[PDB]
Amino acid sequence: SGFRKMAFPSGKVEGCMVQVTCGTTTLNGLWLDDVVYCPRHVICTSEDMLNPNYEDLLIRKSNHNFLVQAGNVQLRVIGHSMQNCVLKLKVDTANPKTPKYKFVRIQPGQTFSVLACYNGSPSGVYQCAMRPNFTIKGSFLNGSCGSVGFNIDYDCVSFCYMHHMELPTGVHAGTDLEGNFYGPFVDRQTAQAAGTDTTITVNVLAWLYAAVINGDRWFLNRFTTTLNDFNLVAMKYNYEPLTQDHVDILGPLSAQTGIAVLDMCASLKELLQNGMNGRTILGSALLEDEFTPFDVVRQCSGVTFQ
Amino acid sequence: SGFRKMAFPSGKVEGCMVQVTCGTTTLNGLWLDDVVYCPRHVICTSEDMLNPNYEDLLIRKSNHNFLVQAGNVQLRVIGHSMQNCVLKLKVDTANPKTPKYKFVRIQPGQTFSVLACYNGSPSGVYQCAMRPNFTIKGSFLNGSCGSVGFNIDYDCVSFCYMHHMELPTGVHAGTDLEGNFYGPFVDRQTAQAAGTDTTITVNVLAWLYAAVINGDRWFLNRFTTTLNDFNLVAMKYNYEPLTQDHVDILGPLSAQTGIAVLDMCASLKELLQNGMNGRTILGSALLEDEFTPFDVVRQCSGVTFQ
Amino acid sequence: SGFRKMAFPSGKVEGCMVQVTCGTTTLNGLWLDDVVYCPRHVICTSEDMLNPNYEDLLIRKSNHNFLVQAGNVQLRVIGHSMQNCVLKLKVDTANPKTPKYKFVRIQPGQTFSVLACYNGSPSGVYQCAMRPNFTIKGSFLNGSCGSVGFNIDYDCVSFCYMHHMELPTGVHAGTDLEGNFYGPFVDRQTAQAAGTDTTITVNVLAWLYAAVINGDRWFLNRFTTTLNDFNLVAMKYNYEPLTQDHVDILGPLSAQTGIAVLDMCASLKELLQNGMNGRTILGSALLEDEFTPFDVVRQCSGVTFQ
Amino acid sequence: SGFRKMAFPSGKVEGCMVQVTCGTTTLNGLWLDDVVYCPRHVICTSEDMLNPNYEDLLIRKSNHNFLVQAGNVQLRVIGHSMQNCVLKLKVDTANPKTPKYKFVRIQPGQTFSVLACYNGSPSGVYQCAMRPNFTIKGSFLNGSCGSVGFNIDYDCVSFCYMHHMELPTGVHAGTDLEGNFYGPFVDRQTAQAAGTDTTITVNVLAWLYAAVINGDRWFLNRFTTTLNDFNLVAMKYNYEPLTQDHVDILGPLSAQTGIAVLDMCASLKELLQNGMNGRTILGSALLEDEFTPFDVVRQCSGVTFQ
Known about the structure:
- 4 copies of one chain form a homotetramer.
- Chain A is of the alpha+beta class.
- Among the domains of chain A are: about 10-90, Trypsin-like serine proteases (Thrombin, subunit H, Beta Barrel); about 200-300, main proteinase (3clpro) structure, domain 3 (Orthogonal Bundle).
- Chain A has helices spanning about 10-15, 55-60, 200-215, 225-235, 245-250, 250-255, 260-275, 295-300, and strands at about 15-20, 25-30, 35-40, 65-70, 75, 75-85, 85-90, 100-105, 110-120, 120-130, 150, 155-165, 170-175.
- The radius of gyration of chain A is 22 Å and the shape is elongated.
- The first copy, chain A, starts with 10 loop residues before the first helix and ends in a 6-residue tail after the last helix.
- At the C-D interface, strand 9 and strand 10 of C face helix 1, strand 10 and helix 8 of D.
C-alpha cells in the first residue's frame, strides 16, 4: 500500500484565495462569505514596522484604500476591522465558492497542509507540523504572507494557520485565523528568535507504529517501562513529555499492532539511549515526527482483532 | 526560505474526479470535456483478473452497464471505447470545470503530483517521482485505481499518470492517459516485477543546489573533478549516470547558485561514502532524489498557477 | 406503554459462555452440547496474523493445547476441527444448560442482541442491526472476540453472529456460527475497510409506524406514490431499495395504522427532500433504522380493525 | 471501541421471575430465598382500583388465595405480609437459583436495567434512568406489573425498582423492593402527574467523556469556565444543576481522559444554540443523559459479572 507524507486536496482553499493591496504592499487574503482575512501588516510600510501603532495606521486608512482582487474581478470593501494581528475586510459580495469552514487553534505536534500563495495565486501545497516552540518548518518567499494552513474533515475546512513572518533560522511564524500568534512572536521589526525546539514524541511513536505495519520490526524488544521514567529519558534527548491524552490517542495503533503504548516507549527509549547505527526505519535515516497517530491510521487502514 | 516536498495545487484536478461503476467494481475516473477516462480493468470482476480478454469483455457490455457519478448527479454514458489499457466513456455532458489540459508521457526521474481518490472523492495529494524501474513509491488503498498524476504550467494541467495496480513489493504501476503502461507491466494478475531501482543523480544534484539557495553549505567541497569520476562511484552507490543534456538543463542552477557540477558531485561522493553523521541537509540525513531542476526553480522563485 | 430499544434476555446465552485459551491467546467460546465454538484466530499469535495458514497452524496444535474453562471447571478437549473462520472444540462433557438453539444467517437490516463477554464472563447486552455493508455498530474491546449475537423466538436461541474484528471506522465484523464472514472481510491482518453504508429503509418505515402509534403524526400527508419512484429517491438519500417482501413484512403495521405502505413511503420521500425543520420524532432528532417492523409490532401490541 | 446503551446480563434476575395470581389478576413476582415480592395491587380486582383499603383486602385473604408458579411447578404460599406498597409471599421452597442480592433505593439520575416480564416469563431487557420527576420512560404492556429494575456489582444483584403502573403521559411509576414509591405516586387510580422534567447534566457530561474515549472529538470547545455561569445557562436549556460531589465523581475518568471539566459545558451551550449542523456524537444528534460516570467506566473497561 505504501506510506508517504500527504497533504489535503487544496481545491476548497484555492477557491478562497484573493490578493490584497494597501498602498505599495501586496499579500494574500482568505475570502470566506463576505469577509477577507489577511495579516494586519498589509497597512504597514517597512518603516512603519519599526514601532507599529496599528490602531492609528488603520483609522488613517479607508475602505477605498484596500484593493481586493479575486482573479479578474475587483471586490469592493464596505468595511474594515482589526482582530488581534489579523485584518478583516467586509466586501460587496459573498464568495460563492465558500466551503463549510471552521477556525481552530491547533496544538504543538498537530499537522496541517499549507497552500503557499503569491498575489492570491496558489504555488504549492505541503504537509507540516506545528513545532513545540510554535514555529513551522515551511517553504515561504516574499509575498507568501496571508497563505493559510488547514485540515479537511467532512468537506469542512479547519483553518489553523495564517503566515506572517520568517525568523533567523529560516522557520516561520503566524497566527490562527483569529489573529493570535502561535508562540511569543509579534508582527513588528524587533529582535525575535525561535526558542530551542524539541522532537514531537507522540508523532515519533506513531511513525514507529507505521514502521511495524510496513515491515520494519528490528527495533522492537520484549521489555516495557512505566510512564515517568520514559519522560525523564525524553527530556535528556529533547523529546516532548508523553501525556495520558497522547497514550489514549495511540490506542488504535496499539490495538492493530498488538504492541502496548508503554511497550513501544521502551523500544524508543533504547533507540535514543544507545544512539543508532546507519539504519533507515521506513526509508528514513532520522526519526520522522511530522506524522500524527491519526495521519498513520488514515493511511495504514489496518484492522484490530479482539 | 525553507525547502519542502511540494505538490501542485490539486483544485483543477479535484473538479474532474468521478466514480465509475461496472457490475460490483468501482474505481475513479477523470472527466475532461465529454469523456471519462478510467482503467479498463473496471470491466473485470473481483473473481476475474487472472488473464482476461478485454476486447470480448467490453463488446459484451453497452453504455447502460457503466454507472458514472459526479458527486450526487448521474452522468449518462452515450459511448464506450478502449485505447490501450484505458477505457474512454463518452457522456452527454461536458465537465463545466474542465481545465486547460494536455496528455504527456513523462521520463524516468521526472516528478508529478498524485491526487489519491476513493469512490470519486479526492482524499490526498503528494509529490512523486517516476522511479528508474518505471514504478512509483506511492500511498494507495483499495479503491485508489484511476487516481491520476499531473504537472501544471500556466493554466494547463499535464496529466501523465493513471494508477492501475500494486506489485508484490508494495510499489505501484500505471499508464499515461493514452493507456500505455510505464515499464513492462500488464493489467492482469500475474508474476511481474521490476526491481532495477537506482537513485536519480540529476535530482540529487538539484536538491543540493536547493540546499545552497536556502543556506545549507556545510557539505560543500572546494575542489573540482571530471564527469568520468562520478559514473564509477555512482554505480557502486546505485546512482544513475549523468549526461551533457542534464548539465545543459542545470544551466539556471549554475547561474544564481553560481557553483560547479563536479564540485557538488565530490561533496556527494564523500557523504555517500561515509554518512553525514549528525549533520543534516534541508532537515534530512538522506540524499533526496524526487526534485527536478524545474521543481527547485519553481519552489525557490514562487511560480503560481492561474 | 412506551417505545425503547430492548434486547433479548441474555440468560440462555450466559449459560453457554466459556473462556478459550491457546498459548498466550484468550477469547470467548460458545458451549453448545459437547462442542465449543470460537474464532479460529485463537490459535494465532499477532505475528501469525500477518499471513496465517490456519491448516498448518491447527495441525501443529493438540487437544490439550486448548484450555477451556466454564467458571471453575476445566473442560477436557477430545477433538478439534475447523469450519470456515470458526474453530470447533469437542469436549468430554455436554453443557447441561444447553438451550434449544439454531444457527441462522441473518440478512442486512435484521436485528439481534449482543452479549459482550470478556474471559467467558458477560459484561453487557445491547440491541444492534446487521448494517447493509455487513458491519455492526457494536461496543467491543480487546477480549470481546467470541461474543455472540442472537434472537430468541420460542425459548429457542437463534445464534446469528460471532465477533472477530474491529475496522478503522470503529464498526465490527464477524461470522455466522458456521464461520462465514458477513461481508467481504477476512481474519487476516491486512488493509480492510467497510464500504460506504446505507440506511435500512424498511426499518425507518417501521420506526415511522411506531411514531404514529405513540402520538406523533405531523409528517403524514394526503398523497401516495408508486414503488420504483420511491426507490429512485431512496438511492439519492443512501436508503436501501424496498423489495416487495419488505412491503409484505410492513403489512401488519399498515393494517393497525390504516396507512398503506406506499402512503408512508410518500411521507418519507418528502421528509427525505429538504430533511425537515429541526424537531424530534419519537424523541429522536435523526431517523432511527435499527428497529425492524417485527420489533415495532412486538412492542406496540395494537389491534387491526377490519 | 463503540458506545451503546448497554444493559446488565439479566440471567441472575431471569432465574427469580415467577407468576403471582390472586382471583383473576396475574402479574410478576421476584423469588429470592423463600420470599416472593410483588405489587400489593395483585389483591386488587380490575374493577376495585379506584380507592382500595389494602389492610382490609389482605386480612380477608389467606395463603391458598395466592397462586405462585415458577414455570410449570406450583409454589405453596405458607405466609403473606405487606410492607409499604409491596406484598411478600413466604413459600415452602427457597429459589435454588437465588443470586447474591441486595435491596437499594437509587437517586434521581441513576441508571438500572429493567427486565420486562409477562406471565412470569422474561420478554426483554433495557437500560433506564430514574428521571428527575421520579418516573421512568419505559416499555410496558398489560401483564408487566412486578417487572424489576437492577444493577450488578461483582456477583451481587442490587434490586432498585418494581413496576406498579403507567401514568397519563405513558411514563411509569414503581417502588424500591421495600414497597416505597419513587416520587409522590400512590397505587390507587387518582389524578397524579410527573410534570417536573430536566436533562441529567452529570450524565450528559459523562456521555461526552465516552465520546472522547471512542474518537468523536469534533464538538469540543477547549476553553476553561466557572461552575456558576454553566448553572445559569443550563437552567435556560432545562438541565439539572451541578455539584462538587459530581466533579469529585468525574475525577476517575479525568485520569484516563486527561481532559478539563468546564470545556464540555461550553461545547453543550454552543451545541444547544447551534443544532449540531447535522454532525453527530456517538451516532447521535441529541445529548443522551442515561449514562452515569460508572456506566461509562464499566463499558469502556469491560467489567464482567460472575
